[PDB]
Amino acid sequence: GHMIKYYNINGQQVPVENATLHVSDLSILRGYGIFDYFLAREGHPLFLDDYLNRFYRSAAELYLEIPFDKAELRRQIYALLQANEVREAGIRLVLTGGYSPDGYTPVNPNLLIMMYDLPASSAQGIKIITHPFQRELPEVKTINYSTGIRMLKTIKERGATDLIYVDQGEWIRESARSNFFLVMPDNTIVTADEKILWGITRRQVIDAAREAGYAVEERRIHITELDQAREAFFTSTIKGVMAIGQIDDRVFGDGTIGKVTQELQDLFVGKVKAYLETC
Amino acid sequence: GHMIKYYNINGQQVPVENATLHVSDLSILRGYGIFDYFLAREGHPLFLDDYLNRFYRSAAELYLEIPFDKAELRRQIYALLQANEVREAGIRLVLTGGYSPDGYTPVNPNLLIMMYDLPASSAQGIKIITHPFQRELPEVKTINYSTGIRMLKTIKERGATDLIYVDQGEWIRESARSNFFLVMPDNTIVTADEKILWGITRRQVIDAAREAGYAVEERRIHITELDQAREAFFTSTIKGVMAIGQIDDRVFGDGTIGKVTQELQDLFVGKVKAYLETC
Ligand SMILES: Cc1ncc(COP(=O)(O)O)c(/C=N/OCCC(=O)O)c1O
Ligand SMILES: Cc1ncc(COP(=O)(O)O)c(/C=N/OCCC(=O)O)c1O
Ligand SMILES: [Mg+2]
Ligand SMILES: [Mg+2]
């Protein structure tokens, strides 16, 4: 439906054409900031309390105080959906280190609320590469995506559409923008527990998997366990559950969505529908 | 002298009050960008070709094309000094991933040239802490200073004014904003060779040290070598050569500037004076 006309900067609704920051902002000069991103459906941001809790935790880890309490931020978000006259959207929160006197020391953070159309996003799982790397402050949703973005050319050149980070080439973590899961041939679901972002999609999938009576192991994953797994999938806000058909030279099954991945995809849609019924 | 009135964005001189970027810029959303920083004295950016070469190398590592060749960028810098009617300044170049369609994929970088007053910056060396950490893409002058800025409260609380990163707590690297050197009791100058930014000040000090006939070892430094060293110092654009009086619970000598550090400080001033004589 309606075109996005407005963002919010520091609690003011602004036309998108005037949504700017002065270049003294620490995100621009020092990549200092946190963010979060969630969808809205039926006029409701999904799992909103979980996202806002993460946003507040992220901010506290950078010693950045959000200038509004959580109920006031929720109001600003809802007000922005209404201003843009949309029920279906992507929503980005950004908290920067602010306009710094010396190009380093935070003084006052800048708060952004941006809004987008829902992601527009055959049988085949996506094809990804392993990449040796460990995200900085990985439990914090920082704005730092240098390595993930710098890798886009390498991902493409190599014939893949995404990656999976492996800490020192040994310990499976996450992609730049997704959590990562395996399903073992006995249907055990396996996902990293440490040095990753605790995705909201990850949380909802794990809960749905356990509520369905699946075994879920949150544990260190050795790179060699890719060869014991039957299925692999990503989770994220914009992907939901997304089947991975190939990692490096390994096709998972015939590369089409595995049994448990398909089940979890439906259960995630169910978690979304259940959440919307509470709004 | 004159107040800073103008920055440059994308080759346009703009009043400082109007130096803004739209919030779709990838530095704001994804911390994607590189920068450089150099002083001007007597109307001349110091060691300018060395800084611009690093800027171009940094850009190539993020696959960001600077929209001007080096001679045209040099012109823009000189034009900005003249516009601001200053001979004495700090100068910041920033190249962001640009206004991205999807908040991730670079499309067109934004180029900023910002300008400042010269840094305003008794006997005693500064007091610093070791911190276990390894900078991401350390040879590249990225805008990513999350850990360095997040550590400001910890540095202060602990009674220090800066830090020295130690890779896995074993291998001495650099501070968030300075290269790091030791001087051993036989007057050997020691500095890391790998996984650090190749500072312009570092380069000028090493050359001056070697031209003076000092032994300079560019090599891995074990954390245990702090106890074999007589002197420690930082190098950076804004510090030049700065004596370190204490690291953790270790006072270097009586904490006042060591012999070789003092010599190198004078030689660096000499490299600056020699450079200005060529302009
Ligand atoms: C590093 C990282 N891990 C995991 C995830 C998955 O977290 P949830 O989305 O499930 O909470 C994300 C998601 N970013 O998504 C941000 C929006 C975007 O990438 O366009 C992420 O950035
Ligand atoms: C990570 C890092 N290492 C070493 C240095 C020293 O490099 P040079 O300055 O000698 O080339 C810097 C300097 N930044 O200085 C940037 C300006 C500032 O921090 O305000 C740095 O950021
Ligand atoms: Mg199939
Ligand atoms: Mg003395």
Numbering used by the authors:
A (entry chain A), B (entry chain A): -1 to 119, 124 to 281
Give the exact sentences the study uses for this entry.
Pyridoxal 5’-phosphate (PLP)-dependent transaminases (aminotransferases, TAs, EC [2.6.1.X]) catalyze the transfer of an amino group from amino acid or amine to keto acid or ketone to form a new amino acid/amine and keto acid/ketone. TA_Halhy belongs to the group of fold type IV transaminases and efficiently catalyzes transamination reactions between D-amino acids and α-keto acids; specific activity in the reaction between D-glutamate and pyruvate in 50 mM potassium phosphate buffer (pH 8.0) hits the record high values for TAs: 380 ± 10 μmol/min per mg of protein at 40°C. The structure of this enzyme, dimer being its functional unit, has been identified. Like for the studied fold type IV TAs, the active site of TA_Halhy can be subdivided into two parts (the O- and P-pockets); the amino acid residues of these pockets are involved in substrate binding, thus being responsible for the stereospecificity of catalytic transformation. TA_Halhy stands out among the known fold type IV TAs by featuring four positively charged functional groups in its active site (side groups of amino acids Arg28*, Arg90, Arg179, and Lys241).
3-Aminooxypropionic acid was shown to interact with PLP in the active site of TA_Halhy to form an oxime that mimics the external aldimine of PLP and D-glutamic acid; therefore, successful crystallization and solving the complex’s structure make it possible to identify the functional groups involved in the binding of this specific substrate. We successfully crystallized the TA_Halhy complex with the oxime of PLP and 3-aminooxypropionic acid in the active site. The structures of the holoenzyme and complex with the oxime are well-superposed (RMSD for Cα atoms is 0.31). Differences are mostly observed for the positions of loops. Importantly, the carboxyl group of the oxime of PLP and 3-aminooxypropinic acid is located in the O-pocket, although in fold type IV D-amino acid transaminases the side group of the substrate binds within the P-pocket, while the O-pocket binds the α-carboxyl group of substrates (D-amino acid or keto acid), which forms hydrogen bonds with the functional groups of the active site. In the resulting structure, the carboxyl group of the oxime forms hydrogen bonds with the guanidine groups of Arg28* and Arg179 residues. The Arg90 and Lys241 residues are not involved in the binding of the carboxyl group; the side group positions in all the aforementioned residues remain unchanged. The observed adduct position in the active site of TA_Halhy mimics substrate inhibition rather than the formation of an external aldimine with D-glutamic acid as a specific substrate.
